[PDB]
Design a protein around this ligand. Structure first.
Ligand SMILES: Cc1cc(S(=O)(=O)N(Cc2cccc(CN)c2)[C@H](C)C(=O)NO)ccc1F
Ligand SMILES: [Zn+2]
Length: 488
């Protein structure tokens, strides 16, 4: 148990002894992000802004996850309208931990993406370049095949959709065998865009870590020793998935993931070939020029191969459930504007089809899915889970709804082009029926339309007939738009 640890520490002893205090402080910052002091945050707020924060329904937002929602209440004591939300978009930018590994994962290593303040962007960059320079010693040719390294991971880090149901709801000690097969099916390779922190000895799983990686390094894999029996691995490494089994440890069930480090360029080649194949297949099915590049794989993180494989399934569901003529007409419009279907595992603000048109960082959006009219692109984020979405296919269809909204309004007036949902016809329909469908449907006309569009093309035909019944004018309006497009 401790012999492996002693030999690893020995191998890196000179490297460790050689670390400056600055180098040590940096490794520490990497392991422990610097959290915002709830103290400081309030002292920067004005009187009217403090008042607005206290009187704001904190847990009732869209943009705030459990981390930021909780942090905001934490000083709600210590102290929704459009005003409240414009405020919250700005405030969200000032409460992010300084977190080097999170910056690397969010950007997929593309750290110059204009998704954070330039000054902090350069700080991250310096820290990352300095850590890279620290990690120069390889594990070597005598140790690499004699040791295993381990990482406990939350299933939600890879797929939040499947992670909702990975644990047997009847018996939490068991893994749902069916969901396991779907997690495993298309899981052949993995990318680490940040620095993996791994244990020399397998650690008992703590709360919400049902994935237990066992990893074999390559001789060239650079790493550094961390106190208490850990390694930090260089960033940008490829991992080939060798085996995925259900195992039992202390009368509970876990998923063992065996992986082998390989050159990242090997994985990136696989991803690029796959991007070629899916474009060729779909250019044909859509009747587009053979060389059209419509589908982008922007893939950099640990569930890489599944982002790739699920795009196929998402586009099949797309084609199965939407009229062929509608798909061809709208997609041609998108390609006319140099549009893309972007399937990605980095956050959407770090996607150029969004940030190229959204200079203000407080206006950048991360979410399961996005449609960006300025670049005619649909963005779909693999790892996350959309509220009130059952799967990614449905998310895509919603975003394509936004594209339908775009194109039909263009056809109305093609010199100066607006969204159909901005026409006074739809606006009136929306103030009547806008509350009759989904909760998120209520947000505005664009979302109501896209939601109605999604529901109208559910595989569940109960959900379809509910639109017809509960929102007959919306239902009617959309079929009209669809007809109008197909006939153009
Ligand atoms: C129902 C549904 C929801 C989404 S979504 O990706 O979750 N979403 C809305 C949203 C909701 C809650 C929290 C956030 C921020 N975390 C964002 C975004 C903005 C959207 O409308 N894109 O077009 C996507 C497709 C869908 F069909
Ligand atoms: Zn939307």
């Amino acid at each position: 148990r401790y012999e492996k640890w002693e030999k690893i520490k020995q191998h890196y002893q000179h490297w460790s002894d050689s670390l400056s205090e600055e180098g040590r402080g940096l490794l520490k910052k990497l392991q422990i992000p610097i959290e915002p002091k709830k103290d400081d945050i309030i002292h920067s707020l004005s009187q009217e802004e403090k008042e607005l924060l206290k009187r704001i329904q904190i847990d009732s937002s869209d943009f705030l996850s459990t981390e930021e929602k909780e942090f905001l209440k934490k000083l709600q004591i210590d102290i929704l309208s459009e005003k409240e939300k414009e405020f919250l978009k700005k405030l969200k930018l000032d409460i992010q931990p300084y977190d080097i590994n999170q910056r690397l994962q969010d950007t997929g290593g593309l750290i110059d993406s204009p998704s954070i303040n330039l000054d902090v962007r350069k700080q991250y960059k310096r820290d990352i370049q300095n850590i890279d320079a620290l990690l120069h010693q390889s594990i070597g040719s005598t140790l690499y095949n004699k040791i295993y390294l381990y990482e406990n991971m939350n299933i939600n880090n890879l797929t939040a959709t499947l992670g909702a149901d990975l644990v047997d709801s009847t018996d939490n000690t068991k893994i749902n065998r069916g969901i396991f097969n779907e997690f495993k099916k298309n899981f052949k390779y993995s990318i680490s865009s940040n620095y993996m922190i791994v244990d020399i000895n397998e650690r008992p799983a703590l709360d919400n870590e049902r994935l237990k990686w066992r990893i074999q390094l390559s001789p060239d894999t650079r790493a550094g020793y961390l106190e208490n029996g850990k390694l930090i691995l260089q960033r940008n490494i490829g991992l080939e998935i060798k085996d995925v089994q259900i195992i039992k440890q202390s009368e509970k069930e876990y998923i063992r993931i065996d992986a082998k480090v390989v050159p990242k360029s090997k994985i990136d080649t696989k991803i690029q070939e796959a991007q070629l194949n899916i474009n060729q297949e779909w250019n044909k099915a859509l009747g587009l020029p053979k060389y059209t590049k419509l589908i982008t794989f922007n893939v950099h993180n640990r569930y890489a191969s599944n982002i790739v494989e699920s795009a196929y399934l998402i586009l099949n569901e797309w084609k199965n459930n939407i009229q062929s003529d509608l798909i061809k007409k709208v997609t041609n419009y998108l390609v006319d504007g140099n549009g893309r279907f972007v399937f990605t595992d980095i956050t959407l603000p770090n996607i150029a089809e969004q940030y190229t048109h959204q200079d203000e960082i407080y206006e950048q959006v991360h979410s399961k899915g996005l449609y960006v009219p300025e670049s005619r692109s649909i963005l779909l984020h693999g790892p996350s889970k959309g509220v009130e979405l059952r799967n990614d296919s449905e998310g895509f269809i919603h975003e394509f709804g936004h594209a339908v909204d775009d194109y039909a309004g263009y056809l109305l007036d093609k010199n100066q082009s607006d969204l159909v949902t901005n026409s006074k016809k739809f606006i009136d329909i929306f103030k009547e029926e806008g509350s009759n469908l989904t909760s998120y449907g209520r947000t505005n006309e664009a979302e109501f339309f896209a939601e109605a569009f999604r529901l109208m093309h559910s595989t569940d035909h109960a959900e379809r007939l509910k639109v017809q019944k509960n929102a007959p004018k919306t239902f009617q309006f959309i079929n009209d738009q669809i007809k109008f497009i197909i006939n153009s």
